[PDB]
From a paper:
The GSR is a gene expression program that enables bacteria to cope with a range of adverse conditions such as oxidative stress, heat shock, and UV exposure. Stress activates an HWE/HisKA2 HK, phosphorylating the PhyR and promoting sequestration of NepR away from σEcfG, allowing transcription of stress-responsive genes to occur. Exploring downstream effects of RT-HK, we identified two homologs of PhyR in the genome, RT-PhyR and RT-PhyR′. In the structures of both RT-PhyR and RT-PhyR′, we observed a typical arrangement between the SL and REC domains.
RT-PhyR and RT-PhyR′ were solved as a crystallographic trimer and a tetramer, respectively. Aligning the two PhyR paralog structures shows a reasonably high degree of overall similarity (2.7 Å Cα RMSD), with a notable major shift in the position of the loop connecting the β3 strand (immediately following the phosphoacceptor aspartate) and subsequent α10 helix (α3 in standard REC nomenclature). The propensity for the unphosphorylated PhyR homologs to bind RT-NepR′ may be related to the density for the typically flexible α4 helix seen in the RT-PhyR structure. Alignment of the RT-PhyR SL domain with PhyR structures from other organisms reveals a shift in this region where its α4 helix is situated between the expected NepR-bound and unbound positions. However, we are wary of overinterpreting this particular detail, as intermolecular interactions between RT-PhyR molecules in the crystal involve the α4 helix, so this position may be artificially stabilized. At the short timepoint, we observed transfer only to RT-PhyR, suggesting that it is the cognate partner of RT-HK. For RT-PhyR, we saw many peaks shift into positions distinct from those seen when the protein was titrated with either substance alone, indicating a synergistic effect. In RT-PhyR, these two pathways from the unphosphorylated conformation evidently act synergistically to promote formation of the final phosphorylated RT-NepR′-bound complex, as previously proposed for Caulobacter crescentus.
Author numbering:
A (entry chain A): 10 to 77, 85 to 264
B (entry chain B): 10 to 265
C (entry chain C): 10 to 74, 86 to 265
The structure:
């Protein structure tokens, strides 16, 4: 049933729009506007592609149209990016669309998609080095994330395996970015650890890395702006880190 | 990466030059004259300072000099604010705008103006003094986000100006300007009914003549390209109170 | 009508062949030879591909049938590498399009394109005067030239200023826009500079490249089209540098 197929894909649309905007409120609003457009003008929903691709195609139309807070530092960083490059990269990595599917969604051809992705990775080489804190109780995961962070040119403030170790580490050195698992070693939650750090140290971008990200993509309650799945591919971690970094 | 860094900063050099001149025309001409001076004399660029600071340091040398921009048209102040040139202390408006709207620290403003941090602080103190010598005007606020509109009103009132009212739609804005002519307009782009604050401003400008307009918007970079008609005065969202105060005083100099 | 479709692609074949040879006279002759071949031997022309693709395919077939120190370096370049690069960058052909044109596989096209991009790192830094009247464009061209490893002798924005700057430092390569700030022409500036300091390779930057590809009057050997991609400016400056000295 197409109603049920669209409903199943809405969480991922929220994931994508939240990553583009850095915000749950903006991302969830763009995802909702996409569904509204499809209900108001059903002819917008291409039936010759998969519902997932058709849904994201409509979202990219709304995304391109002027319309619908953000730090002025983030606004300056984002303003220097080549248009449509971050969209093509995120669609290709975190959303795992093939290059032809990406060309469909952005109403382009596959060779321009390849250029946009290549331009995305070029501008990622000019980015400044930041400091990243990792909240993760599985030591092999933490070590793997450290390797990815380092090869991106970033520094690690440290690894925290419990909420309390995380609140303590953030007090020693305010990170530029937090990578956060949910269930920690002492059965405390990375969600609480993050909330406590942010109350104390101000807004810092946070990427939650979790199995079943769908449970944080409902739109019904406060939820993260950046979500990577477990298991993860390295390309998805690099895209999320570079994306969240724009929001300092 | 100096070339890339200088080009990234050119939009902000336009913002600054436009505020000082009162016109997109002369401001864009002054910012492009700054870049043309660096390409002509690369040694003009200080590598010992950030590209942003070095760019603005070159701009201030040109601004202060007896010379004028060799541009496609005519460069200059704005005629309206010529009468205030006799009452204002040199380098005070420059120091205030650089340290507020342009977000330079007083040490970076000292470098830019080839001065010391203490002279810059006194220049900023003398700018705020001469702001008390300014007469009260009437400000119209076009803005649909009510909390921002309220906040803007508290700043305007705290500076001693009156507020004609707040309009949240293009239709409310054309009515408001007809009820009471404003000396200055603060305008957002996307209004409550999705109508356009640019369109609203143009309509007011037709009926009442030239009134200084300050556009308040996120991503001001999209109005700082010099590739199309664009505002002379731009405040960012989010803003700091000191930036709103520096933009309201600056634009008031160009009022009737 | 396939005759008109072929005619409309001739200017771009002249661009390609001129850049490969470094000379208007040779590039225009190679482009005409390609049309002549198709008229003489209609079998050469494949109707299953786009008329632009089929025309470049016939030219590559024909393509395969100065200064000793400059020839000594150009001889170290791997065969078919410059062609695959220029076809993919300035000619905006897709990898599969280039593979058809060279009667190769898209696999080999990337092997070639990579080898060419790697052999560009073995290039010598060179002086590059930029005659652009739009400062924003000049800054961006200075970025690509500097990243490639070349110096910038200067940036001029008027005919008289470019002629003056040529007197201070003889460039090895001139990037020249057609219409300058004082309504002067970069063509006249380039001609006056070359008349004085001798022959120097020139890459003309221009919106409207087709009106410089007629073959009916003296025209540039190398042309970058506004707007441009960095890969295009990089393929045009590497190609043109082969003819510097
Ligand atoms: Mg865990
Ligand atoms: Mg608004
Ligand atoms: Mg021009
Ligand atoms: Na669709
Ligand atoms: Na982008
Ligand atoms: Na997300
Ligand atoms: Na020639």
């Amino acid at each position: 049933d197409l109603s049920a197929q669209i409903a199943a894909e809405l969480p991922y649309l929220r994931r994508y729009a939240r990553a583009l905007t850095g915000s749950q409120s903006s991302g969830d609003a763009y995802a909702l506007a996409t569904l509204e457009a499809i209900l108001d003008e059903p002819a917008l929903f291409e039936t010759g592609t998969t519902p997932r691709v058709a849904l994201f195609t409509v979202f990219h139309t709304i995304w391109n149209s002027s319309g619908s807070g953000l730090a002025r530092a983030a606004q300056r960083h984002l303003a220097r990016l080549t248009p449509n490059t971050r969209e093509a990269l995120l669609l290709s990595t975190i959303e795992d669309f093939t290059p032809e599917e990406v060309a469909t969604i952005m109403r382009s051809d596959v060779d321009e998609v390849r250029h946009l992705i290549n331009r995305a990775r070029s501008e990622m080489e000019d980015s400044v080095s930041g400091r990243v804190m990792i909240i993760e109780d599985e030591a092999i995961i933490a070590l793997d994330l450290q390797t990815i962070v380092a090869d991106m040119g970033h520094a690690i403030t440290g690894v925290a395996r419990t909420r309390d170790a995380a609140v303590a580490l953030a007090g020693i050195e305010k990170p530029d970015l937090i990578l956060a698992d949910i269930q920690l070693a002492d059965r405390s939650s990375g969600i609480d650890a993050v909330n406590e750090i942010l109350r104390a140290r101000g807004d810092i971008p946070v990427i939650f890395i979790t199995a079943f990200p769908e449970r944080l993509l409902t739109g019904e309650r406060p939820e993260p702006a950046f979500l990577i799945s477990k298991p993860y591919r390295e390309d998805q971690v690099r895209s999320a880190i570079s994306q969240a970094m724009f929001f300092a």
